[PDB]
Symmetry: C3
Subunit: 363 residues, 3 copies
Amino acid sequence: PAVADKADNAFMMICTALVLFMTIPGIALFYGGLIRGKNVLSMLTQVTVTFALVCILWVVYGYSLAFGEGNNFFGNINWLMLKNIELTAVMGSIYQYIHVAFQGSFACITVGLIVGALAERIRFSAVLIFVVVWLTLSYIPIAHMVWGGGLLASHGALDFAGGTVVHINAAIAGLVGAYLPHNLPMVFTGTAILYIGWFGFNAGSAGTANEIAALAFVNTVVATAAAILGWIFGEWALRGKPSLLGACSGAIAGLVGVTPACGYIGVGGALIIGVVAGLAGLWGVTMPCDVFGVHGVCGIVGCIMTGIFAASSLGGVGFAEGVTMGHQLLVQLESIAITIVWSGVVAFIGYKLADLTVGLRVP
Amino acid sequence: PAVADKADNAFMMICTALVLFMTIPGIALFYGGLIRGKNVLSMLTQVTVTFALVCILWVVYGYSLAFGEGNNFFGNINWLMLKNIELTAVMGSIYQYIHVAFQGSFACITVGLIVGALAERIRFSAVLIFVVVWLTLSYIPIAHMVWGGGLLASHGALDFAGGTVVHINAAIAGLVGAYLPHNLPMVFTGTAILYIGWFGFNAGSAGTANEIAALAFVNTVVATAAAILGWIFGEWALRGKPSLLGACSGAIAGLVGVTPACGYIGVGGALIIGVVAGLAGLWGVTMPCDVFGVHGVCGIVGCIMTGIFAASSLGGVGFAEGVTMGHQLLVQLESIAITIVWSGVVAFIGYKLADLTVGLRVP
Amino acid sequence: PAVADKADNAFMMICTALVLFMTIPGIALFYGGLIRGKNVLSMLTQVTVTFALVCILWVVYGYSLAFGEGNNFFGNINWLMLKNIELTAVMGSIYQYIHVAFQGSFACITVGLIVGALAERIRFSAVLIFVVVWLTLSYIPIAHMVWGGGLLASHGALDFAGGTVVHINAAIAGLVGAYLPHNLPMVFTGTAILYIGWFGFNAGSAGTANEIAALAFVNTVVATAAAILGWIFGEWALRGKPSLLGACSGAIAGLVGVTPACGYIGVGGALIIGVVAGLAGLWGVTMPCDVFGVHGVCGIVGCIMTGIFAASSLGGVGFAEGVTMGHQLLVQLESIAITIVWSGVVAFIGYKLADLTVGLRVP
């Protein structure tokens, strides 16, 4: 019977704290510097309260429905309040309780991304309703499909740290909501906290302190740097000079782009993905809700590029046996399409339920 | 002879840095946003200088007096400047030097809690005198009694991370002192740093990256979330709406409440303790010194509830052999009573000595 | 063949993230609170973009030239884009990829120290040119000479975490540049982030979570505290009262001073080095570019004192076999002299090349 490795337990608990740091206070500060001053306090309150709500829903039934064994779309209700999970139960090479906390931290940042941007325009009670509906019917099934042995995983979709589950998923929810900077030092500080926490997000996705965690770590450093330079170069070419917001946006573009690819590509691949993501991000915003443009565009770019750069010939770890680059690409595209439609439909349902119960627009 | 486990060494060094982060700059920013603007610089200076003083006193004689073998109340002077502690000496499953640093970080946050709140009203030299007296005669003996094999531990008191040693101890010292918000984004940032650092505080209290550290980690996430919701719900019911300060206070209430219980209870217990702590905290402040109301009330609530929720039947790790819930409860109450009187008496002595030497009230 | 230790892999990846945290956002916030308000945005942009540039240069050829085998001054070009480094290659007791990231993080903070201070006065394109020249011809060779088996290491120079490679190297580059506070809460926050990240910087320099990492950790706590008190005492004696900037400067003085010594001295040595560094730092500034006075003076003081306190008789780990204190002192002095001249010459070349190509002074 599988035994827990204390080095992996230590690494994973610290990586979980780093991911939690991305929301509290990372994302809150990022949006806090971007949105109007008069709306900052309310947004910080909404991010904090919804963060709490996600943590509770996760332990009550979220983890069980996302990671329990069930079908292609949902898990089960056998792990309600973590019932039936022995304290010494092992998942991979770490205690399952750590896996519960790590996975929960990803649900939290995904929700923080959406709430932080929409807090300005949405009624408090309406956001709570939306979070409950969307976490339960979008985040949970998509996590199950991708990381819980569901539909996408069973077709061999590659998404190391959440290009689909986190980025595209949140970007679409934010964009559906949108359809329905007073402090740049604060934006920079939030970006910096997101970047440092992202090492736990990306490297921790290996589930162990091995060579894949090391690869994801280095690729995170490289893609982020390449994206900062790509964005800044585009900014200098199009606007005549770099800007602080541009530099921070480029960092996020690279972080998002490398998210699905970090544990599968070589450093050359990380550099290319970083540059392309930084430029795509800049193109995206050119064509606080702009954040959904960066997470959306860059998440799609990253997910597609994972299907290319995972190739051995391109310095990647290699595709699964019997899988051509062409096949992996189709699988990546299908995963992206499914995430977009699934998240969009659920988000629409969430916003509509809130609007029909308490009303959407801030009173 | 006991050998050090490198995974535990790594986990404990990182947890120590996280606890140090709680003081520098966590607590300083929390108070920095709460106190009057004109007093911020002075308070930050006092927190930094007293933090330095604690670090030095700890290494010179503090660690030895708190953790050396002695009697029910004090250790000894055999580890002055860490003399006689071999570099390769092991304490538990980690090098003793790491145990020295981890334990020292708890002394630092306890003192930061007191200094941050009272800096506005106390003379610089008077706070230095108070810190010396109170750390030496209150923090050290209480740490020894609870975690150094002293009186309370010998009676089987349960206090995983310091409901008594840190929270009640500091709350009473602060309240004795009191008897004798200009920047809410800053308060939120300090709260967030305290929360992230608290994973090192709570999970690191296991002394190893095992299933107890994992349990404490998950319970920290759960109790904090439950407290945020409990406080916010009470706020909505009593005031008509949540507030950012309420959300941050609820987070601290849950963190404090779960501190003594985190490594002994089940997640159901963590949820209940979190909700009760959040509500008790709100009731407490209703009836910057208010922080002592939260740490005091919530520390007491947490310490008492540990004596209930540690029970196997309630999902806890179970009480010691031959100990009924009733017995544990009496032991918890006795530990609380002793901490309150001990800290109160020493604090009074400390403030009086400062007042008789240099004068208390800021000149 | 050497195998990777997962505990060391975990510790080193987390220490690397902590070092990265020192630059992003540590150093940026430290300078951000010190420099004029009108120059803050530009400085934050320059620190971020140059951080990205360093990350990319490091992976493309930097790591290979600094850590590959070559001669007394430079490595080689056999590790371009990390080519020829197997994903599972081990360096010491960790995967080589982690060693690449850890080493890269030191290059980043060294450059951040220089850019943050000079951003106010230098043209954007001129700083990029300077960084390329100076990282390539000063940071890389000095790192190779000290930590890559080059000239200084081959003569037994002691420099645990970079008194020469980082501190003196950057201080001289900054001073050559100089020759050619609006937000103290922000300065305090940057200092706090630098301090917490410094545990990864100092303890991670052991390359493993062993007793030397524990020693460096404790010495970091002690020297920092002793320096804060030494500076503050001098400030009280010379100016009549402590100040927040003084307390933060004292912390940095102790951190810099203990950098070369942390893994070689006893806690008594750390206390003495801390006090002397805090006082030397205060004397230095008395006689944002003042930061180069602290890193320069304190780096020299630390490097010299390592040659004294590494002695067994003084509680240190002991000098190499057959090396007297007198010999080690000469070696420390020679290493300091070489670092100063090497960095100064290259910096002058860098600034001149930029001035001849795009012009130095901000347009």
